[PDB]
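FYI - complex with chloride ion, inputs then prediction.
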Amino acid sequence: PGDPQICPKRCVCQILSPNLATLCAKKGLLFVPPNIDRRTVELRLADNFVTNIKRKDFANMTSLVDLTLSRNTISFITPHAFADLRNLRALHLNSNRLTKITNDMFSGLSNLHHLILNNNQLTLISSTAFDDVFALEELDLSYNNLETIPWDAVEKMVSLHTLSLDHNMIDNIPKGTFSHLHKMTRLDVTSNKLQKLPPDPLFQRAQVLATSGIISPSTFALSFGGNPLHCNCELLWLRRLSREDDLETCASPPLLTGRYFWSIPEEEFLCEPPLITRHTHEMRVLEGQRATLRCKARGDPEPAIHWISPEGKLISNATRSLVYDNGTLDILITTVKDTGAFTCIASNPAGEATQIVDLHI
Amino acid sequence: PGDPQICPKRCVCQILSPNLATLCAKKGLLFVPPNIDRRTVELRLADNFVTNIKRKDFANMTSLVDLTLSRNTISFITPHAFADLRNLRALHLNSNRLTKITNDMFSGLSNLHHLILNNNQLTLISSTAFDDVFALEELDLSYNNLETIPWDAVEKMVSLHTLSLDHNMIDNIPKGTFSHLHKMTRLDVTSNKLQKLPPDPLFQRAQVLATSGIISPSTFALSFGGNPLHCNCELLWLRRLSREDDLETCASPPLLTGRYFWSIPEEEFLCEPPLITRHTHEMRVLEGQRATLRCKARGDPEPAIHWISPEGKLISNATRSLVYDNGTLDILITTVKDTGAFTCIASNPAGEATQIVDLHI
Amino acid sequence: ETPPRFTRTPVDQTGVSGGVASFICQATGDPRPKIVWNKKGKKVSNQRFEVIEFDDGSGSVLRIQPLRTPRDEAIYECVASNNVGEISVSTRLTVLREDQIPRGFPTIDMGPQLKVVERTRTATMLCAASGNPDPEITWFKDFLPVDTSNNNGRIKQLRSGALQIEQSEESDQGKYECVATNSAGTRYSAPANLYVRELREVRRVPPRFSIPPTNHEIMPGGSVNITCVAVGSPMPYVKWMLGAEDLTPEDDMPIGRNVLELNDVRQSANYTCVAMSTLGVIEAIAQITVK
Amino acid sequence: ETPPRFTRTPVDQTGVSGGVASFICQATGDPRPKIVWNKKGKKVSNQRFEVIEFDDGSGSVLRIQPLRTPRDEAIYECVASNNVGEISVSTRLTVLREDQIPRGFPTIDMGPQLKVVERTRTATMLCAASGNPDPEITWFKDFLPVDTSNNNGRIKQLRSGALQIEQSEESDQGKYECVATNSAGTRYSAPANLYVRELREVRRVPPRFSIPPTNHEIMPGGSVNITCVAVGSPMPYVKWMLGAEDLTPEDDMPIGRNVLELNDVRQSANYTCVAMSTLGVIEAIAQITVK
Ligand SMILES: *[C@@H]1O[C@H](CO)[C@@H](O)[C@H](O)[C@H]1NC(C)=O
Ligand SMILES: *[C@@H]1O[C@H](CO)[C@@H](O)[C@H](O)[C@H]1NC(C)=O
Ligand SMILES: *[C@@H]1O[C@H](CO)[C@@H](O)[C@H](O)[C@H]1NC(C)=O
Ligand SMILES: *[C@@H]1O[C@H](CO)[C@@H](O)[C@H](O)[C@H]1NC(C)=O
Ligand SMILES: *[C@@H]1O[C@H](CO)[C@@H](O)[C@H](O)[C@H]1NC(C)=O
Ligand SMILES: *[C@@H]1O[C@H](CO)[C@@H](O)[C@H](O)[C@H]1NC(C)=O
Ligand SMILES: *[C@@H]1O[C@H](CO)[C@@H](O)[C@H](O)[C@H]1NC(C)=O
Ligand SMILES: *[C@@H]1O[C@H](CO)[C@@H](O)[C@H](O)[C@H]1NC(C)=O
Ligand SMILES: [Ca+2]
Ligand SMILES: [Ca+2]
Ligand SMILES: [Ca+2]
Ligand SMILES: [Ca+2]
Ligand SMILES: [Ca+2]
Ligand SMILES: [Ca+2]
Ligand SMILES: [Ca+2]
Ligand SMILES: [Ca+2]
Ligand SMILES: [Ca+2]
Ligand SMILES: [Ca+2]
Ligand SMILES: [Ca+2]
Ligand SMILES: [Ca+2]
Ligand SMILES: [Cl-]
Ligand SMILES: [Cl-]
Ligand SMILES: [Cl-]
Ligand SMILES: [Cl-]
Ligand SMILES: [Cl-]
Ligand SMILES: [Cl-]
Ligand SMILES: [Cl-]
Ligand SMILES: [Cl-]
Ligand SMILES: [Cl-]
Ligand SMILES: [Cl-]
Ligand SMILES: [Cl-]
Ligand SMILES: [Cl-]
Ligand code: NA
Ligand code: NA
């Protein structure tokens, strides 16, 4: 281990802190310099033109802690390029051209407290891409194309302080994401595609509300203001909160389009019960054949369609049957055991409505 | 024409300047407000969440001059949405999600002195997209994915002051681009993929070179520092200029890799003469059949392959013959007129080298 | 005065890894009995163990979330103590992990969702469960057992696992949980919130045809436009049908007006225009006869 | 003293829209004749009309770029005047636009490119042109006619339209233009720059085989590796060939070392290893005989 102190030709390395520093920032590098002392604790490559991270570049660096690639051209990172750094606590990839997060990317990282991806072009993240790092204090995805992220891996990080999703395309946030997650100060959803938001105790602590002469703090900071909110009873819990007005606006339903979210009274947030539009009254097909049952119901929000076997409880994806998203029912092998009266049920936050179909085989 | 003064519900409209102002900036709109007085000279929609520009939005606005869509989510603009504004001198689309510039986009614009597209995702621009505005003083494409732009339309704008291509993927700049250009102060190519640069009197006036005690103003400002320069005699004219050192770096040839461009002495900028690698010695095929002639030559830079008919000046893509990029020759209909000794010539800035192939039919 | 007595005691329970469990212990006495929960011979303390007193004050409820196996596997003890007496009850908690789940263990096929009900109206919290044998459904509101007893009262559990609250109060709103129990263990559904909002009454008008479908006579090969319009509060969806065949898909269902434009039909059939709303369905007939 | 005299006079010219044209007029006299260029009866002035004096001082050159039709169509007049005399010459310029170009008009098939030559070496500026009839090629350096005269001198024009400069001076560098002329008109090639750089001499080594291809004997069905290495300055490309069949594509040509690994060849053939450089080509024979 004992050796001289080597420095890249174009960089400046400092021994001043007991941590070895290698400062390559703003040196006009087109690639990661080949000669860097593997004992470097702090490596600054930021504000360079490097387009590619080879595995050789960051390989066999034990003591690296801060690594800043920010403001580079990087469009590609070789898998396991970062496998080597077991002590890396912060990685700044921000302001780069990365369009994807591969599952082997960050597959050596562990003790990482900051992963900064902000201001990249990423359209997708691999399902297992974040599985290797559960210890992240901060995950910054800001300013990307992401439609969704691997949420089940996000809730597996219990140390997460701030999650910045702002300025993305995100469709929705799963309900049970933050349920058992704690110690979370901040969440930024601004400038996204979210129609609704799931309730959560953290979001109950996002508000500041108190009686006169008493002051209630805000333990959670939340900004959803940039989204095309679909404003109905599902957002009522959010409307009942006492918060600042960030000028979030309701896109839908058409009655509320253009109205500011906090200006609308609580009573005007309205969801509507299910109504069954279409059905198959009676059906006759023999045993062991392809069968199809149509039930389609409308409402605000669009109701959930479930089925009920004759004198029975519930169907599902299973060995003898399959259910779909649009409501159709496929019994692949029909049997005389299935002859009878099936019930179609449609559920909504406002209510539920049922119809009946009859099946003879 | 005489009517009341109408204002969007959520905006603030000012009659203070003889130009009618409508200021919607930072109002949290998800879409362009339907009610805007068509007499508006100055319209600020900036820092809003609009995802779509409909034809109806900007339609029948005669007097509009400044229109700022900056810092929006716009991913789409309906064709001829801007057909209506003949008096628009400035359009700020910057900091948006646009991935394409359609030909019908900006197909109503004329008198435009500023088109600001910077900080968008554009990967492509239609060939005729810029044909409608030749009056542009400033075209800012900065921070995009563009591999190339419709140069022949760029040289058709003779009033162009500043062209900002910086932080793009641009491959190369055509040689005869800037000959027709005049009154051009600034060109920013920084953080691009350019290997070389074409000579030009503007680039000859980009340098500051003077004797001691004399200060030289730079009439033309040019920044190429962010590129993977291929450093050979083709860049020698650039190396002979006296300019500031912006820390541009040579990517190639391998001998110069990593070297700073301005540190390398002029004599070390080396291009190499052509060398013919492959040939077809003799060929026999009859008349009216598919024929192929292989000539492939290497060098730095890669030499230009041309052909010589027996006792003839040269060939071309034509009725009787076709030439390709890789150097192969296809005579689709061979004739006894084509029987003879063909000469293959490969040209380079360093020199040229020839070989001979014989053809009997 | 009077030594305590156990009015209700817990039972042996079995649950999954990450699930929850509840032990209900309530007592009577003068003085009011002090309810204690013990793991081995010491009062239970941990981040996941939460005791919830009853609004009556008769007792409390021990709730363990989430379930950690085998940290929580042990015997537990309810202790009802007062001035003149101390009495005890024991129950056993076993927790098996996610791969140890046998087939037939209670599984929640459809859990409760968000539900918003106007005050003094009927709210129904749905639940569906299965297993071998068929599991029994019980409900918990705000970590407390819901009283479904057939004794005359507001809250009533249905034939389906769904719970029904008529004449909804403001105190009805909270976190509801569906609990499936059988010989194989106990499973809790994902929690769901019931929101109680103030009553807003608005005139509700059933659907009536503003323009009924007009009987039209066109010789074969032609094309006609039948105007069918319906009105109401809510404004009903309008749909055309030939027999049982829906002539418009559910994706586009014009609310105001639906016109039927027939293409070169040279045979004869009777067409039906339908108007559907939550207030009931109305359907009228349009007779096209070809000569 | 002596009235002037026309040593060279312009000629009628025809060009395209956007092209250029040059009229060469030089005179002799004592005093030196003042050369004037007139459009109609007035000296030419405009942004596109640029007069270029000769280094001799004998005369000037009128260059019109670009050509604007029909603004520039007119008769033009060179005037040589001095103390004791004034004399005149006329020439007609006609300019036809891009769609008026007849077939056979001079077209430049291959124009000159950037060329960088070491001092006191041979630089060759290429040009190719075609048309009916075959056009004549003339050259212009820095808006001045290049003197290609066979009178003993440095600059010589080749059988091809290419211009050749032996023993390149520093004053040789500039902007060169190829000019094709025939009965149909005159066409200029795109301008190209010649860069003259200082001479750097390096020792040049023709290719020699460092490891010549080794004759190998392997019975049929086997696989062998033949080591062929060549050296030189420049280091030659190494390529394998069976007869006239190139065994490596031009995309990957190993500079240092090329090995031939043979696959299951059960017949017999003689293999050739080749090393190519700008200093020439060397080829050696590797023999594989199957038994
Ligand atoms: C790490 O890699 C470097 C170079 O790749 C090597 O010199 C060093 O020995 C390696 N360390 C270990 C522990 O193998
Ligand atoms: C059930 O199947 C449908 C399609 O057959 C699928 O979309 C859905 O995700 C499945 N759900 C489960 C819980 O397997
Ligand atoms: C429902 O989905 C199935 C496939 O999942 C498709 O084949 C069918 O056409 C759909 N029907 C409707 C009415 O959407
Ligand atoms: C402009 O369009 C609007 C609506 O599209 C119309 O009311 C108005 O009359 C039009 N003005 C002119 C001058 O065509
Ligand atoms: C000649 O052929 C090349 C490719 O085969 C093509 O790109 C080029 O446009 C052709 N030239 C003309 C004048 O069409
Ligand atoms: C050369 O290019 C032509 C078409 O441009 C193609 O058909 C041919 O395969 C190419 N040959 C090689 C060796 O690349
Ligand atoms: C259906 O149409 C036929 C002829 O078009 C008619 O005879 C019959 O009465 C109609 N149905 C009813 C229920 O009236
Ligand atoms: C080719 O190979 C044969 C047999 O191996 C040999 O006799 C002959 O001499 C070789 N060719 C030359 C030119 O030596
Ligand atoms: Ca060291
Ligand atoms: Ca892996
Ligand atoms: Ca930290
Ligand atoms: Ca994946
Ligand atoms: Ca949006
Ligand atoms: Ca019902
Ligand atoms: Ca007005
Ligand atoms: Ca158009
Ligand atoms: Ca201006
Ligand atoms: Ca196009
Ligand atoms: Ca680059
Ligand atoms: Ca030669
Ligand atoms: Cl910095
Ligand atoms: Cl690279
Ligand atoms: Cl960048
Ligand atoms: Cl602003
Ligand atoms: Cl929209
Ligand atoms: Cl944005
Ligand atoms: Cl007592
Ligand atoms: Cl614990
Ligand atoms: Cl009512
Ligand atoms: Cl005299
Ligand atoms: Cl002019
Ligand atoms: Cl030499
Ligand atoms: Na950069
Ligand atoms: Na924005």
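The two ends of chain C are 98 Å apart (CA to CA). DSSP finds no helices and 27 strands in chain C.
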